[PDB]
Amino acid sequence: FQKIYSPTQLANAMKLVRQQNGWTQSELAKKIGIKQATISNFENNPDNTTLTTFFKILQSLELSMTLCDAK
Amino acid sequence: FQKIYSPTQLANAMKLVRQQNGWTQSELAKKIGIKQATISNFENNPDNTTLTTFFKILQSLELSMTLCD
Amino acid sequence: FQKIYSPTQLANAMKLVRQQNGWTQSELAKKIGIKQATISNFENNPDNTTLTTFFKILQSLELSMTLCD
Amino acid sequence: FQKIYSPTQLANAMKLVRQQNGWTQSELAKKIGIKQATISNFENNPDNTTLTTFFKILQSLELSMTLCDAK
DNA sequence: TTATCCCCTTAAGGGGATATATATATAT
């Protein structure tokens, strides 16, 4: 996949994956035990999103992250 | 690098690098435009840190972040 | 005190006191009229030390020396 | 016995003990493996006598020494 | 017996100094 360098770049990448699998945000939120709300919050306005939050999103998406070189 | 699954994890990994390249929290603070306490704050208690700061660090630390399966 | 049977013995005992009363080789050197190297010389290699010095120390160290059976 | 505070005070104490037991200096010297000579040296002029020497004298005299308080 | 005296070599203790260790101040 692609490397990411900004708050938004990221949330944008998640949404893609979300929709591409057809998972209702409300349903994603339920699994990790949060509000379909905060998932929106994250999806529209990521800059002020916390990390635990972010990471929870990640797990629900059956995804994971990794560091690497700033090309 | 390895597979990161949480804040304190991403924090341990990021800290590990900070020292390895010899860098400290101050020299990287001025560089990317933020407070020194912030970074330290991130390293020991990363949970509530915002995403904007997580990245100001990635660029000061000058490493990327891609995702995997 | 205990029963002393040799130079390195009398040296170990005498040194032990020097530190215990907090004293050092210099402060006791000036006091009894001799060189600092001398005392140190006595403490690690006491065998060839002269009797005059052994006593300048006893009086600076301010302890006596009697004999027993 | 008496406490001792000087090179001579000492050698003097030894001589007493030597004679009081009737031990020829030559014989004392032989036991500790030295010269009846150095025993004289020690006996007449102690200030410049070494310690090992002194201690050897002591053993031949079946004596021993101890530290104590400068009253 | 034991007080001295010869020859030889090993060093002590003083004068004059000094790198290291032992225990403590001070810089980011």
Add this chain to the structure above:
DNA sequence: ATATCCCCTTAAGGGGATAA
């Protein structure tokens, strides 16, 4: 605040052994 080192002068103690 110890342990060490240089240069020097002075004596120790072992070889081996004689006046007193």
Add this chain to the structure above:
DNA sequence: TTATCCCCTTAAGGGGATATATATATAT
């Protein structure tokens, strides 16, 4: 569904500083 909006409490990140720790100079 999903982008927003209310009420409440927990804190982050900045300004402005500072005792302690971590690694290093300096006094007898």
Add this chain to the structure above:
DNA sequence: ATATCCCCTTAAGGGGATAA
């Protein structure tokens, strides 16, 4: 060169829930 603390201003995310 870390971790911490004060005061403040600003937003997050959970309660619980409605326009679009």
